[PDB]
Design a protein around this ligand. Structure first.
Ligand SMILES: NC(=O)C1=CN([C@@H]2O[C@H](COP(=O)(O)OP(=O)(O)OC[C@H]3O[C@@H](n4cnc5c(N)ncnc54)[C@H](OP(=O)(O)O)[C@@H]3O)[C@@H](O)[C@H]2O)C=CC1
Ligand SMILES: CCc1nc(N)nc(N)c1-c1ccc(Cl)cc1
Length: 216
């Protein structure tokens, strides 16, 4: 069976173009993947993009009650053989720490932070602290939710793609070049097909679009 399908594990990210460097061995002016920039110095490479922000918020928050029973059954079945509704959002520690206190935990979604060092003692926000992907799966198996969104960062995307635990990738392309030090991990793209390509959008002069890739 495909766990990414049974537990509806999707990834959502936004990547921009990478700003060249005149020094160092990391300049890739000819990179085969134009949009691969994820972060810089612990924060996003670009300045507040309200357009992607709204998009991100809608995707990760939207739930359809009518479609849940079907998911409930699909899961009850898998679990059988193995033996307010909200989506889950999963993020690495650095990502969680990069979010300003006032915006955490992300409202209307069940928050999960992956970390082997954070403790419930110092993390007062309502969030599940998970020690590993393995434990993440243990959590989803005993949790009522709609879809599970992996929202970052690079390390977390890598682990999930590497384990073939991603069913869909919601990929925002930011058409701007900014300095970057964290990039989207490479994986076998032949395993996916683009299933949604939005019209172009504009943020203060910078264009961007939204793509969705679904596993074959
Ligand atoms: N453009 C985009 O869409 C996104 C950009 N970002 C950007 O990416 C950068 C942060 O990403 P990155 O550096 O990859 O870090 P992450 O945000 O993934 O956090 C890394 C930390 O998460 C924890 N972690 C990772 N995997 C596991 C695991 N399997 N089990 C338990 N804990 C785990 C560890 O915490 P610990 O050390 O406590 O164990 C780890 O050091 C920032 O610059 C941020 O702004 C982040 C998300 C999305
Ligand atoms: C709004 C930015 C954004 N847009 C998209 N399309 N995907 C994401 N995963 C994020 C994101 C970045 C950093 C953190 Cl910490 C959490 C989420």
């Amino acid at each position: 069976e495909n766990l990414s399908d049974v537990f509806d594990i999707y990834a959502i990210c936004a990547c921009c173009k990478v700003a060249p460097t005149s020094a160092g061995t990391k300049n890739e002016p000819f990179s085969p993947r134009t949009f691969r920039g994820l972060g810089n110095k612990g924060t996003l490479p670009w300045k507040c993009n309200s357009v992607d922000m709204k998009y991100f918020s809608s995707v990760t928050t939207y739930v359809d009650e009518s479609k849940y029973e079907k998911l409930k059954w699909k899961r009850e079945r898998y679990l059988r053989m193995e033996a307010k509704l909200q989506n889950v959002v999963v993020m690495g520690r650095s990502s969680w720490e990069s979010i300003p206190k006032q915006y955490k935990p992300l409202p209307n979604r069940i928050n999960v932070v992956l970390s082997k060092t954070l403790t419930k003692e110092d993390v007062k926000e309502k969030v599940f602290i998970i020690d590993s992907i393995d434990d993440l799966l243990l959590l989803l198996k005993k949790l009522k939710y709609y879809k599970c969104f992996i929202i970052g960062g690079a390390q977390v995307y890598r682990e999930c793609l590497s384990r073939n635990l991603i069913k869909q990738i919601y990929f925002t392309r930011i058409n701007g070049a900014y300095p970057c030090d964290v990039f989207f991990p490479e994986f076998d793209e032949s395993e996916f097909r683009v299933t949604s390509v939005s019209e172009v959008y504009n943020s203060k002069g910078t264009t961007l679009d939204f793509l969705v890739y679904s596993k074959v």
